[PDB]
Amino acid sequence: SQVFGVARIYASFNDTFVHVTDLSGKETIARVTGGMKVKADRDESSPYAAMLAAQDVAAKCKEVGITAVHVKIRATGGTRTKTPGPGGQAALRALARSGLRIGRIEDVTPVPSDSTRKKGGRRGRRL
Amino acid sequence: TPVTLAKVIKVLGRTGSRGGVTQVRVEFLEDTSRTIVRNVKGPVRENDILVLMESEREARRLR
Amino acid sequence: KFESRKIMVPPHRMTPLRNSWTKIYPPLVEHLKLQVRMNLKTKSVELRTNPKFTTDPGALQKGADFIKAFTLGFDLDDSIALLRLDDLYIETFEVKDVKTLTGDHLSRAIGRIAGKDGKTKFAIENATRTRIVLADSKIHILGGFTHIRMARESVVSLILGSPPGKVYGNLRTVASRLKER
Amino acid sequence: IKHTLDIINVLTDQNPIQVVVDAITNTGPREDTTRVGGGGAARRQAVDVSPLRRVNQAIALLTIGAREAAFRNIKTIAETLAEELINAAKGSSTSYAIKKKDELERVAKSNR
């Protein structure tokens, strides 16, 4: 049927990566960023900029002609939050909205068995 | 000039800061299948006829 | 031209699922025009769309968000508003992502986020125009992106030991500076 | 009004009541703007004014333009009002309410 790809969505607290690859992790096909899309420094990781970057990715994949993707959404992992943010959620909303074939939705977040010391100190990290 | 002809079918209430504008549900007169939500300044009863310009514009709420 | 997604059901949420299922599935079937099946054996909700239905590929995503948010413990009507509004999203965090807590420190932190009779939590949801599920170690926020950001500020304020009165002060500050604009 | 209908007769419009009704029709702003709150910097939003208010608005604009034109000249109220109804029964932009109808509709189109 369709040409299957590998979509990889990284969700940092400041950024959203959408990353289309071939099978076996071969080569990068479509790869933009919310940073390179929207010039507002407040809006570097908005769901709006995430949807714009995801539609840019969909446009470049249709330029290549590859339609199907196996999507692997991914949080920061490590020691920061292990659930991918609403940037990845709106990116999935956009890649559904852009009419690309979706093979399989999987949430691959790197979970440590047993973590080391975080960069928060004893107090807590942020705010 | 596209003169959009419209029909009032359902009033939604009184909105605006001053409480003056009206949200109106609209049966488009030329094509029945379009139901629009518009903002009308003035007195409107049911089954009235409006004269819009754009059938495609919709505004959510007002303050 | 079918498209099929499956989502698992935990038994913790399965009893409200089997209770309110009669209100859950018809707005997906009729008001959103999606094909909805349930394998109660594997506890799997199966959302598939057909050539019969309206070709709205975003409606399948919003239905998956509907079933996922109800799976996360959120209410029916909030997830129906997710079916209506697009700008509402979900945050999900852990307690140990922000500050390491152990034993009764975790319990007291959860109690200070909740407050007596939920009065700390509910006053958040009125003033942040969001909805929150406080799971075991998980927090789940549902609302606009600026609004879930402000709820994240409030809950990170609560989790680091700050008293609820300062949270009411910052809460009414953010509410006053947001409702005015 | 009787003098004005006589003038619209003698200015080669055999149907002066139709001249009145066409000036009502051709000078009604279909959509206008209201002053929404907007969050401090109060923008103006295009509302689509009711046709009863379009009648009210057109009659108001015509009477204002005629009262402006007939004031401080030798030319009578009947002649100025007939000139306005003839230049406004068919859109010519030499009358008053044609111009102000155009201004309200261009503010409405600019501000939707």
Contact yes or no for B57 and D112 at CB 8 A: yes
Resolution, Å (one decimal): 3.5
User: In sequence order, what are the residues at sequence separation of 6 or more whose Cβ sits closer than 8 angstroms to the Cβ of residue C48?
Assistant: C2, C3, C4, C5, C34, C35, C37
- Report the neighbours of C using a cutoff of 3 or more CB pairs below 8 angstroms: A, D
| Matching residue, tokens 């949270």 | C167
Buried b (16+ CB within 10 A) or exposed e, D15-33: ebeebbebbbebbbbbbbb
Phi, psi of C108 (to 5 degrees): -70, -35
Residue B38, CA distances (Å) to A4, B1, B9, B23, D112 in order: 45, 20, 11, 6, 12
Whether the CB of A99 is below 8 Å from some CB of chain C: the reply is: yes
Chain CA centroid to CA A12, Å: 9
- In the numeric block, which tokens belong to residue A90? 């709106």
Q: What sign for the dihedral angle of Cα A36, A38, A39, A43?
A: negative
User: In sequence order, what are the residues at sequence separation of 6 or more whose Cβ sits closer than 8 angstroms to the Cβ of residue B45?
Assistant: B8
Of the candidates A67, A45, A54, the one whose C-alpha atom is nearest the C-alpha of residue A18 is A54
Amino acid at position D29, single letter: P
- In the numeric block, which tokens belong to residue A42? 């407040």
Where is B11: in which H helix or E strand?
strand B4-15
CA distance C11 to C21: 14
Helices (DSSP H) in D13-96: which residue ranges?
A: 16-26, 51-70, 77-89
Tell me the shortest Cα–Cα distance from B55 to chain D, in angstroms.
11
Of the candidates C143, C144, C171, the one whose C-alpha atom is nearest the C-alpha of residue C155 is C171
Of the candidates B54, B53, B48, B56, the one whose C-alpha atom is nearest the C-alpha of residue B24 is B48
User: Looking at chain D, which residue has its C-alpha nearest residue C179?
Assistant: D39
Partner-chain residue, chosen from D30, D37, D109, that has the shortest CB–CB distance to B63: D37
C43: left (phi over 0), alpha (psi -120 to 50) or beta: left
Q: What sign for the dihedral angle of Cα A87, C112, C79, B13?
A: negative
Q: Do residues D54 and D28 touch, judged by C-beta distance below 8 A?
A: yes
Contact yes or no for A93 and C86 at CB 8 A: yes
CA distance C166 to A118: 27
**CATH numbers and ranges of domains, chain A:** 1-127 (3.30.420.80)
For B47, counting Cβ atoms within 10 Å of its Cβ (0-12 exposed, 13-18 middle, 19+ buried), the class is: exposed
Q: Which pairing describes strands B4-15 and B49-52: parallel, antiparallel, or unpaired?
A: antiparallel
| Matching residue, tokens 């959302």 | C47
**CATH numbers and ranges of domains, chain B:** 1-63 (2.40.50.140)
Q: Which residues of A touch C98 (CB under 8 A)?
A: 120, 124-126
Q: How was this structure determined?
A: cryo-EM
CA distance B39 to D48: 6
Helices (DSSP H) in C9-103: which residue ranges?
A: 11-26, 57-71, 76-84
Strand intervals (E) in C28-137: 35-39, 44-49, 88-94, 131-134
Contact yes or no for A46 and C97 at CB 8 A: no
Q: Which residues of C touch A14 (CB under 8 A)?
A: none
Tell me the shortest Cα–Cα distance from A79 to chain C, in angstroms.
7
Q: Which residues of C touch A92 (CB under 8 A)?
A: 61
Chain CA centroid to CA C35, Å: 23
Q: Which residues of D touch C180 (CB under 8 A)?
A: 39-40
CA distance A59 to B55: 30
Contact present, B and A (at least 3 Cβ pairs less than 8 Å): no
| Matching residue, tokens 């249709």 | A62
Q: Where are the domains of chain C?
A: 1-84, 85-181
CA distance C122 to A40: 33
Q: Which pairing describes strands D32-35 and C3-8: parallel, antiparallel, or unpaired?
A: unpaired
CA distance C105 to C96: 12
Chain CA centroid to CA B28, Å: 10
User: Looking at chain A, which residue has its C-alpha nearest residue C157?
Assistant: A127
Size of interface C-D (CB pairs under 8 A): 4
Q: Provide the CB-side half-sphere exposure for D107 (13 A, CA).
A: 14
SS3 content of chain A, % helix, strand, coil (to 5): 30, 30, 45
Partner-chain residue, chosen from A82, A90, A96, that has the shortest CB–CB distance to C57: A96
- In the numeric block, which tokens belong to residue A41? 């420094």
Neighbouring-strand partners of residue B50: B6
Of the candidates A70, A44, A72, A67, the one whose C-alpha atom is nearest the C-alpha of residue A57 is A67
CA distance C149 to A47: 12
